[PDB]
Amino acid sequence: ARKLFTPITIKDMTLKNRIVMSPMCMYSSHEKDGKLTPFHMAHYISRAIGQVGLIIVEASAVNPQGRITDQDLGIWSDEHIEGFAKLTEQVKEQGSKIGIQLAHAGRKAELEGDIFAPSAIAFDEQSATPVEMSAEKVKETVQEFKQAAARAKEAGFDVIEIHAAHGYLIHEFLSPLSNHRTDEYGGSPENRYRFLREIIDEVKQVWDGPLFVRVSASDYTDKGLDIADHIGFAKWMKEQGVDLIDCSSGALVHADINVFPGYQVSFAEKIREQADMATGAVGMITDGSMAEEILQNGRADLIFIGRELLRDPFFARTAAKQLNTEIPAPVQYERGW
Amino acid sequence: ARKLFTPITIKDMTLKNRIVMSPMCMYSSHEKDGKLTPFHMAHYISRAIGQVGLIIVEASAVNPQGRITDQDLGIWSDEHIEGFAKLTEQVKEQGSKIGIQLAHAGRKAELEGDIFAPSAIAFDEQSATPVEMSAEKVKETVQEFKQAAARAKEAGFDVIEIHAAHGYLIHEFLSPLSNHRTDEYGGSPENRYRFLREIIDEVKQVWDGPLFVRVSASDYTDKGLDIADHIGFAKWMKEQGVDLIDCSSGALVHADINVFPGYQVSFAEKIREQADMATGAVGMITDGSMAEEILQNGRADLIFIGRELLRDPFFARTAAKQLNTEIPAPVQYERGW
Amino acid sequence: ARKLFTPITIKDMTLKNRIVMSPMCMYSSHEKDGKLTPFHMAHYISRAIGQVGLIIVEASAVNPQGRITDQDLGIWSDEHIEGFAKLTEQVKEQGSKIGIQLAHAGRKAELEGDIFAPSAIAFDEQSATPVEMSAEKVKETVQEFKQAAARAKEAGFDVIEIHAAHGYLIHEFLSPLSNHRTDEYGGSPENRYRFLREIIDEVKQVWDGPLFVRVSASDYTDKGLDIADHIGFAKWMKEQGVDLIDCSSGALVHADINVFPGYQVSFAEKIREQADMATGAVGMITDGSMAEEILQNGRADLIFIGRELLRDPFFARTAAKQLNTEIPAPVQYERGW
Amino acid sequence: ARKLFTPITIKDMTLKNRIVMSPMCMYSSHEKDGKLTPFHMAHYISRAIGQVGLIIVEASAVNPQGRITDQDLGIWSDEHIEGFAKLTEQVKEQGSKIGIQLAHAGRKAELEGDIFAPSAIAFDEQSATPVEMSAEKVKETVQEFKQAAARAKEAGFDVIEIHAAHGYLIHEFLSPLSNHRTDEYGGSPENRYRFLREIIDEVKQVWDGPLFVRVSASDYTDKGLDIADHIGFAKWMKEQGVDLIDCSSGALVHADINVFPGYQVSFAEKIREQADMATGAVGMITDGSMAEEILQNGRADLIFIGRELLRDPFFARTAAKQLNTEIPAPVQYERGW
């Protein structure tokens, strides 16, 4: 069979295929309370009906002021557990595994009131200057990721992913372009990584399941982070028990990025090879042929699909056809698939 | 602008495009109570997110023993109103109009216990022989369609379609092959049409909105009904205020049917021309080009899509692309569509 | 088997499928002598390798001043026979049948010097006013079509098509908008049809094989010709022994034409039904599904494909795949098809 | 613009895009004299009309007994020059550059009479045992490649490619599995490479244009050649002035090969990186997205397309559409592309 449709086991979780619905913000929590809405349910569950092996729920803030927008999903409150519990139950009932992306927007939070970051440096010209987190505020945030993970476990998620990419809080700490701290959380690569190190260790105190970490493998900026730096971080994450690194890139600051089909795959293959860590490839992957090639040539272990799943919720079926192979259809659509 | 994406107003309902999700049974009411489940919600709402102009909910039984299977949706009880109320609200919120198909499986009901029909004639050698409805029972069934329509109105549906096709109860009364009654509901075309006539008149006492009727325009059998018969019924339906005839075919009895792309279009075109009645074309229509041709050549007014919407929930986008035109995308997917 | 890939026999010619490469001018006779060039050979033969059932060569002038442009193909001289003989042999060798479209551009000829027409009326404000053909000149032109047909037979063509459409010479005689003659070739429909009648009768004196006539089934203009007129001409053509009417439309004069997929199909269906004449459907037919529908619903006998064959020379294979059926591939490409 | 459609210059040859028609035997020289036929002309020229940047003509034997089959093209005689001269002229006239693959089947020659190889070892159970080439016979063959190159230059080819792959003669000398010689052409890697070294040096005495070499980057067999060996050969070829290595694989002997989209790309990228040599990627590349990714991620410099160009001669257009970009169409098809 095609590798794209061959199961893979990570910890005590077996995925029926290697297609992953990349986390994508829907800005649909209209009550601004971080809760799920009917749209979210239809949005996610339809891709489970569509046979996506693993569905990763969009960035969910671990702190209200850590949201990107006031319409973001949240997991900073026990009040969020009930809705997520229904979502995981329904997604899994359709045959897919489900994960959640724990996040904090840091200096990129588009909210009124003080926003936070490792250093008081604004994202750009049109952004507010963030407040430099006190050492204790940083430690409180670590606890919030821990608390959020505990809620995710209770809600029934199969996988937890830490959002350490796209110029958000953790990414801000990792990069010297945004982290000018002179305390235990700044300076050396080890210190810049400390925030993430503590988040991983604390999350593991309440979560023993598959743990993913999404990173921006490059800042595409002089004096910023590059793949070499991330290969280093990957080795440390492996030692800590991280199961897979979801390889994205950019967004820490404005930069020129050459975008094209599979433009971030090199990051996934280099980390996989040099850090001996399973990786997720993402970035303009839109057809089954590319997906199969990435897996067969050992460039990544899972294929994250974003925008193509917005155009085609049933990408799994489309990819199967493109690869001239057969996959099980949801029972209700046996007469059409 | 392409005709497929041109609005049409029926009564007080304006459809934003001519794409209709054909009613398709999902056999997913696992509690065997005819109620909706999370699967149904995601299944239908996803096509609304997908911009389908009109979504018609699958055959919903007006009487429990009128179900095709014990996992069919139902609308025989006021308890069914709550679920449907949530569904219509959520579908309309995405920007689509919604309808429901009122039905009764007649002799094709796959349930334990007596099943009913106009005459005690089994569908085939593998089916149970139905019980001939008493005149009283027939009139009670008319009232159940009326009562069901009332529930549909309360639930917020935009359109109601009467299922008078696919060999089910109403179709059984219409055809001489299945109706050998010696009372007012059998014999001449007037008598054979009487059941449907009374259903339409009664439904109109509680529902003044768009009213569709799906028929099997031919039995493809000697001594059975053919397009000439249905043109006759269509003229009577027009006088009664039916707004559109959804043109399907067959299934009253086993028959040899030449299936091919647009194989039922001739029925929609003839009824449209000869009965001066708006029609819905359905049957192996899988792309925007065929849909546009059918509309532009005046063969039908609405394009019903069945299986292609099971393969591609976002057929509307796919069709827009095939026709080299643009249509509004759901706000949440503007970065992908 | 799909009707699109079902054989059909016209006279003594059996076509292996119903796909026809519509005649399309290539304006590539760079020596301005109407002779074939390597481009023409590869252009046509590639579609034969592509399994097209019948390839009709572009408009070939029966008189040099009857060319549309000075780079048109010609068949006004015996010197044109050698090239055509090689082309028909090579096309047939690949397994396809081949035809040629005999033509005369009339007032739409874009050449230096006097151009001719039934009446001195220019095509539009940008065109030169043609010279009214003397009765002698008209009869000489009839002989040139006859002589051209003789050359086509000698060159080995399987089918000959008379170009009586797109506002060219013959079409000009047929329509009241362009024909104001006061002799035997103008006035009543009998007189306006006379030019074509004589061409058909004379051609038949030297050619007994399949004979096609392409017409513009409507002028889309007040006081111009419409489908009713062409149904009348079609009945006369049937009596004369014409085997099939290739149904196109317009171009006699500028007009508002609603173009859409299958916009000329109604013409092919009406002529087929009312004149009991085999017809070729053409006009925005781009996929196997539409082609199959047209054939199965009895709207035409052959499917003429134009621009789609310019985008996809191997449309036959593409259509077979779309129809989920199999067709023989050229032996040399068995490892790819 | 897309890299796939950006020109690239090699020596004094500029390709308009980076799509290459991979050499593919057509077994169509029916007279068994190695000459071109009308089919060959239509076959190749149609892809030039189709905008393929570089068309590489199928394996052409440098010696009659070096043909794979008696229906192969040849270039062992001056009698072959005339036909090739017409072919290059016509392909270039349509806008493409053209190359020819100089070949010798060695022990895989399916011809009657003695066949040759470095050692008397048969390809398999159903193959004849080849005659071990005397040192002089090897030197004569080197001269034949030289002579063939001289003919190719006279015929007007833009590129010459040496076929050192697919288990044929040169490949046989390169691999220790098939080369057991104990003279100057066997033993060490240097000696096994000597035959190719001499062919390259001699060809360069009569040809100063772009020179490609196709290799089988792996024998997929224990004790056979692997990518490490070919990276070594690549460095030697670079020193000799070879411009690009066309990276295929296998066929020396029967072996288990895992085939999938882009299954030979790793060979192209490793040789490109470690030998600092331009490379051509080939092997189940069927869409523009994969092609663009290969080029943008620096895995190869040219994209060789084989079977997809047999299914779609106009792959260039299809790929352009897939990449949402525009490319010039042949003037004759401007109204369709």
Ligand SMILES: Cc1cc2nc3c(=O)[nH]c(=O)nc-3n(C[C@H](O)[C@H](O)[C@H](O)COP(=O)(O)O)c2cc1C
């Ligand atoms: C509407 C939208 C919302 C997104 N939200 C998130 C998010 O919450 N978390 C994240 O890590 N990436 C997010 N992304 C980035 C995507 O997950 C994905 O990595 C990116 O689009 C590259 O992949 P693609 O080409 O398959 O879409 C978003 C992208 C889009 C288009």
Ligand SMILES: Cc1cc2nc3c(=O)[nH]c(=O)nc-3n(C[C@H](O)[C@H](O)[C@H](O)COP(=O)(O)O)c2cc1C
């Ligand atoms: C799984 C399935 C369930 C269906 N259930 C219904 C139904 O409840 N009512 C109805 O009128 N037609 C029903 N149909 C018939 C379809 O609505 C449609 O008319 C038929 O599939 C022809 O169209 P298509 O070729 O676009 O699928 C069903 C079809 C399928 C495949």
Ligand SMILES: Cc1cc2nc3c(=O)[nH]c(=O)nc-3n(C[C@H](O)[C@H](O)[C@H](O)COP(=O)(O)O)c2cc1C
């Ligand atoms: C470049 C080009 C040249 C054409 N030349 C001719 C011609 O010589 N004779 C003719 O009858 N139609 C000619 N046509 C009209 C086509 O045969 C065909 O009827 C028309 O394109 C409608 O079909 P299509 O939508 O499949 O392309 C031409 C069309 C194109 C695009």
Ligand SMILES: Cc1cc2nc3c(=O)[nH]c(=O)nc-3n(C[C@H](O)[C@H](O)[C@H](O)COP(=O)(O)O)c2cc1C
């Ligand atoms: C019919 C056919 C003939 C071929 N002949 C040759 C040849 O003469 N020389 C060569 O180097 N490769 C030859 N090949 C191998 C192809 O060039 C190509 O490298 C292979 O098919 C892998 O690519 P693809 O997946 O794009 O077809 C041939 C392949 C096919 C299907």
